[PDB]
Design a binder for this molecule. Structure first.
Ligand SMILES: O=C(COc1ccc(Cl)cc1Cl)Nc1ccc(CN2CCCCC2)cc1
Ligand SMILES: O=C(COc1ccc(Cl)cc1Cl)Nc1ccc(CN2CCCCC2)cc1
Ligand SMILES: *[C@@H]1O[C@H](CO)[C@@H](O)[C@H](O)[C@H]1NC(C)=O
Ligand SMILES: *[C@@H]1O[C@H](CO)[C@@H](O)[C@H](O)[C@H]1NC(C)=O
Ligand SMILES: *[C@@H]1O[C@H](CO)[C@@H](O)[C@H](O)[C@H]1NC(C)=O
Lengths: 533, 535
C-alpha cells in the first residue's frame, strides 16, 4: 500500500489517492473533515473542531457540496453549468482538500489556500476550474481548498443573538486555516508561509481575513481576484441582515431564540426557495445572505477598516478581468441575453442603471447615466450595451479594487495589481461579454496544460506564466521571477504612480491609473452625493 | 463744398456728412466716423431708451472717432500693451452714441453686403474705435461695407429697476437696435445693401448678437449672425429682474440714494461716481462676472435666453459660432490668487480649490466639489502645471465653450444652419505669457485682417491666414455659407448638426473637421449641473 498516500494528522490517519497530471503524478487528499457536521441544532452556529476518528479515513474523493441555490437560467449550457454543484448537496459539507507533489515535498513548501466565490450564496471546492493538481505538479506547490457554508446556512444572522450571530461561513474558512496551521506540515507544507487566494466572494473573504485580527496569525500573504471586502455587495449592516432574516422567517412560516428555533426545523430546500425574495430592491450583483458588520468578526465596516488599518508588514496581489460586469446583465437587465448581441436602446440603458445601481437615488442614477453615455454617440446601441456592462463592473469590482489597492498602498502594504485581458478560446458565452467575471481562474490553476481540454498552445504557455507569477508571489510576496532578467518587471502599485500590468498573450505591459477618472467619480463623488442629495 | 473730394460727401436721414479717405495696404477706403445716431443720452436721459438723433444742419465732419461711452478703465497692468489695447482710446463721455462706416473707395456701384460689428467687454467696457476693430481691411480687401456702433455700457447701459419707467434696463441693447435701424434706413447711401446685413461680435458683443436673434423687434434688422466666444445663454450674460433691482439699489445706496426718487437721485450723480462703485455690487467674489448686464425684463427678453433658445423657431436662421482654444486663461489674473502674467502661474491644489469657488461663484459646495472632481487629473492630482491649466479650463468651459456648445446644439436641432469653429492660432505678436495659450479676444485681430498691415510685424503665414479668415466671414455674410463656391479643392466647412457635431479648426494649417464640441465635459456643465442645482 502506497506510503505516500498515507498521512497522519491530529485527528487520525488519512488515505489519499495518486492522481495524474500531464507532467507526472500528484498526491491528492480529498474530503478531509475539518469540522463537526453543522447540522440540526448546529445550523447557523459557528463551526466546531472535528472529533478524532479511528482507523484510516478514506480521503480519495470530493465530499458533498454545501447546501445552496442552483442556477437555472440556461439549463444544460456549459457556460452556466460549470459553476453549479458537481457533487450531492448537503449541510454536512465541512471538508477541505489538499494537493501536493508526489512524492510529497522533501522540504517544507509554501502553501496556497484557495477560497471560492459564488456571491456567498453558492460555490464548491470540487469544481473542475479549482483543480489543484496542475499547480502542485508544475510549481511543486501545496494547494488547499475548503468548503464553507453559503447562503442562509453560512450567513443568516440575527445580530446579537447567541444562536445566529452571523458570519459563520467565514468562521468555517477560519477553522480550515487553523487546520492548515496544525496539520499541513504533515503533508510537507510550510505553515509559516501561507498564501490565501480567492475570486469574487472568495476574494472578498480573503479581504475580510485581512481585516479580522484573529485570522491574521493564520496567513502571510493574500491574493484578491475580482473582489473586495469593501464595496456595495460584500457586507451588510446588522440592521439590514436582521431585516432579511426575519423576512425569510416570515416567508417560511416563522424573541430571537424562538425565531431561530423554528428556522432550524425547516428542510434545507425550503430556506433556499426564498433566498432571492428578501432583497430590498430589484438588482443584479446583489446577494441576500453575506457577511455582516457584527462588530465582532468585523469590528467596523470594511470601508472604515481599510481607511484606518495598519498594513505595514503585508503583501497583496489584486486585479480584475477586462469585463467585470458583462456576465451579470443577463441575470436581470431587460434586453440582455447570451443568445443575441444584446443591442439596447437608451431607454433600456436608463432602466438598466436602476438595477445595476439599486441603492442609487434618482439624482445619483442620473449622474451615472450622464457619466457613461458617450455624448458623441448617445444613442448608439453598441456603446449603450458596453456602457451598461461597464457600469456594473466598475461599481461592483473595478473601483472597489482601486479603492482597496490605494488604501493598502498608502498604509504600508506591498501591492501588485493587474488587469486580465485574455479571453479563453473555449469560452461558450457570446463575444459581446468579452472577458467575463471569473474566466481568469482556469488559467491561474493551469487547466490549459491538459491537452484534452482543447486550449491553444499559446494559452498553455500563458497559463504557465500565470502559475509562475502566482506561486512566485506565494514564495516571496513578489510575483517576479527571481533569476530572470528582462521582462520587463511587474512593478508594485503605489499611490504616486499607480502602476499595474496587463496579463495577456503578449509580454507584461505596465500601465498607470486603474480607471482613475471614473473611479474618482465612484469613490469620491457619489458618496458625497447620496450623503446629502 | 467745391474743392472737397466728391467721393467723400454723402447725405443720410439726419443731414450731410463729410468722410475721410483712408490708406489701407492695398489701396484707399472711405471712412465715415462719428456719425451720431441718437440724441445724447445725457442729463434727464441717463438710463433712458435712446431717442433717434434729430436732423442737423450743414455738413457734419465725420472724419474722426467720437467719444467712448463712460466706463471703468482697467488698471491691472499699467502701461502693458496686453491690457492697454482694450482701454478707451478717445475721451470718455455720456455723449457717445455714434457709429462708424467703412466702404470701398470709390463707393460700391452695386449694393454690397453689410457687416455690423458689436464690441465686447463684459457689458461694462468697450469701444467701436479700438485698433483691432479697424474696418479698413475688410472694406478694401473684401469690398465689405462695415459698420460699428458705440452703445452704452455699465450702469448707463444696463442699470435697471425692472418695471419702472425711468430705468427699464437693457437700454444699451436698445442703442444697438437703433444703430441697426439706422443701417436699414441710411446704408444704401453708402452703397450698402440693407437687405443683406450680417451681425458679428465677440464676448459680450456675441451675447448681444444672440439677444437680437432672441428679440423679435431686432429680427427684421438682420439676416445672418456670427457669435465669437460669447452667447446670450450662460452664467454671465444676463441677470433676473430680482438680481438687477438688487444690484441697482445697492449702487444707489453706495452713492447715497419709490423708484422715481431713487432714479432721479442717481441722475444727479457725476458719471465717475457711478463707475467707481461698479465692481462693489457683485454678490460673490468672482471672475467672469459683470455688475450691469442685460436683464430678463419680459420685454426685450420675453423670457430667459435658455428658455428662448430651447423652444424657439430658427428655421430660417444662419449662424456662425466659435471659440478660441483657451477661453479662460485671461480671466484668471483678474481675481484667482496664484495667477500672474509675470510668472508661469504654477499653482497648488489648495489654490485650485479656492480658484474654483471664484471661477464658479454661483456653485454650492457640492457643485464645486463636482467641478473639482471632474477637472482633477487623478494620476497627477497635485501637479501644478495640470492644475493651472485645469483652472483655466474650468473658467473657459463654464463661461464660453459650453454655453456655445449648448447654443449650437439647440439652434441646429431647431432648424438653424450653424457653422462652428475653434480658433487655435496664437499671434506671433501676443504680449501675454505662453501659459495663456490662445486667450479670449485674440482671434479678432485676424478676422479684421490686421496682419495685412506690414508695420504690425506679423508673419507672412499670418498674413495669408488672416486673408483666409476674412474670406470665410465675408463669404458667410454674402451667402450664409463660409465656403467658397469657386474653390472645391480646399477642404469644406460642413454645418454643425446634432447627429454629427462637426466643427473646424482655424489655424495655420488647412481646415480640419472635428467632432463633438467638448461633448463629454459640456454634458457635465449642461445636463448634470442644472439637475444638481435642482436639489
Ligand atoms: O449573480 C447571479 C444572479 O443570481 C440569481 C438571482 C435571482 C434568481 Cl431568481 C436566480 C439567480 Cl441564479 N448569478 C451568477 C453570477 C455569476 C456566476 C459566475 N461566477 C460564479 C462563482 C465564481 C465566479 C464566476 C454564476 C451565477
Ligand atoms: O474680466 C475682467 C475683470 O475686470 C475687473 C474686475 C475688478 C476690478 Cl477691481 C477691476 C477690473 Cl479691470 N477684465 C477683463 C477681461 C477681458 C479683457 C479683454 N476682452 C475685452 C473685450 C474684448 C475681448 C477681450 C479685458 C479686461
Ligand atoms: C435578445 O434576446 C432576448 C431573449 O430571447 C430578448 O428578450 C431581447 O429582446 C433580444 N434583444 C434584441 C436586441 O433583439
Ligand atoms: C506669480 O507672481 C505674482 C506677483 O509677482 C504672485 O502674487 C503669484 O503668487 C505668483 N504665482 C506663482 C505660482 O508663483
Ligand atoms: C516692427 O519691427 C521693427 C524692426 O525691429 C521695429 O523697429 C518696430 O518697432 C516693430 N513694430 C512693432 C509695432 O512692434
Amino acid at each position: 500500500e502506497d506510503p505516500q498516500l498515507l498521512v497522519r494528522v491530529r485527528g487520525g490517519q488519512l488515505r489519499g489517492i495518486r492522481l495524474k497530471a500531464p507532467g507526472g503524478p500528484v498526491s491528492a487528499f480529498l474530503g478531509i473533515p475539518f469540522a463537526e457536521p453543522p447540522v440540526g441544532s448546529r445550523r447557523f452556529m459557528p463551526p466546531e473542531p472535528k472529533r478524532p476518528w479511528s482507523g484510516v479515513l478514506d480521503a480519495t474523493t470530493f465530499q458533498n457540496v454545501c447546501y445552496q441555490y442552483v442556477d437555472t437560467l440556461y439549463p444544460g449550457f456549459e457556460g452556466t453549468e460549470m459553476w453549479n454543484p458537481n457533487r450531492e448537496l448537503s449541510e454536512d459539507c465541512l471538508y477541505l482538500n489538499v494537493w501536493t507533489p508526489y512524492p510529497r515535498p522533501a522540504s517544507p513548501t509554501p502553501v496556497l489556500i484557495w477560497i471560492y466565490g459564488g456571491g456567498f450564496y453558492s460555490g464548491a471546492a470540487s469544481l473542475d476550474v479549482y483543480d489543484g493538481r496542475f499547480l502542485a505538479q508544475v510549481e511543486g506547490a501545496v494547494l488547499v481548498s475548503m468548503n464553507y457554508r453559503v447562503g442562509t446556512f453560512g450567513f443568516l444572522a440575527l445580530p446579537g443573538s447567541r444562536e445566529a450571530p452571523g458570519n459563520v461561513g467565514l468562521l468555517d474558512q477560519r477553522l480550515a486555516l487553523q487546520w492548515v496551521q496544525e496539520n499541513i506540515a504533515a503533508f510537507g507544507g510550510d505553515p509559516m508561509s501561507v498564501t490565501l487566494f480567492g475570486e469574487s466572494a472568495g476574494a472578498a473573504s480573503v479581504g475580510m481575513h485581512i481585516l479580522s485580527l484573529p485570522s491574521r496569525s493564520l496567513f502571510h500573504r493574500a491574493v484578491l481576484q475580482s473582489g473586495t471586502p469593501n464595496g456595495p455587495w460584500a457586507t451588510v449592516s446588522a440592521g439590514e441582515a436582521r431585516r432579511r432574516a426575519t423576512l425569510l422567517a416570515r416567508l417560511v412560516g416563522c424573541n430571537d431564540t424562538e425565531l431561530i428555533a423554528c428556522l432550524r426545523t425547516r428542510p434545507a430546500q425550503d430556506l433556499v426557495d426564498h433566498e432571492w425574495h428578501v432583497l430590498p430592491q430589484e438588482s443584479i450583483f446583489r446577494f441576500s445572505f453575506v457577511p455582516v458588520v457584527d462588530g465582532d468578526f468585523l469590528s467596523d465596516t470594511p470601508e472604515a477598516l481599510i481607511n484606518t488599518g495598519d498594513f505595514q508588514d503585508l503583501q497583496v496581489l489584486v486585479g480584475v478581468v477586462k469585463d467585470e460586469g458583462s456576465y451579470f446583465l443577463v441575470y436581470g437587465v431587460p434586453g440582455f441575453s447570451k443568445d443575441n448581441e444584446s443591442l439596447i436602446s437608451r431607454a433600456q440603458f436608463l432602466a438598466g442603471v436602476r438595477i445595476g445601481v439599486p441603492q442609487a437615488s434618482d439624482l445619483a442614477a442620473e449622474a451615472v447615466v450622464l457619466h457613461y453615455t458617450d455624448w458623441l454617440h448617445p444613442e448608439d446601441p453598441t456603446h449603450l450595451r458596453d456602457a451598461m456592462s461597464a457600469v456594473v463592473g466598475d461599481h461592483n469590482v473595478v473601483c472597489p479594487v482601486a479603492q482597496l489597492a490605494g488604501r493598502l498602498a498608502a498604509q504600508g502594504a506591498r501591492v501588485y495589481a493587474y488587469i486580465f485581458e485574455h479571453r479563453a478560446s473555449t469560452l461558450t458565452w457570446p463575444l459581446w461579454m468579452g472577458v467575463p467575471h471569473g474566466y481568469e481562474i482556469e488559467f491561474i490553476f493551469g487547466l490549459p496544460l491538459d491537452p484534452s481540454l482543447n486550449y491553444t498552445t499559446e494559452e498553455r504557455i500563458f497559463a504557465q506564466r500565470l502559475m509562475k507569477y502566482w506561486t512566485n508571489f506565494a514564495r516571496t510576496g513578489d510575483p517576479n521571477d527571481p533569476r530572470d532578467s528582462k521582462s520587463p518587471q511587474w512593478p508594485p502599485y503605489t499611490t504616486a504612480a499607480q502602476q499595474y500590468v496587463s496579463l495577456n498573450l503578449k509580454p507584461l505591459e505596465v500601465r498607470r491609473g486603474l480607471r482613475a477618472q471614473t473611479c474618482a467619480f465612484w469613490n469620491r463623488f457619489l458618496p458625497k452625493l447620496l450623503s446629502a442629495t
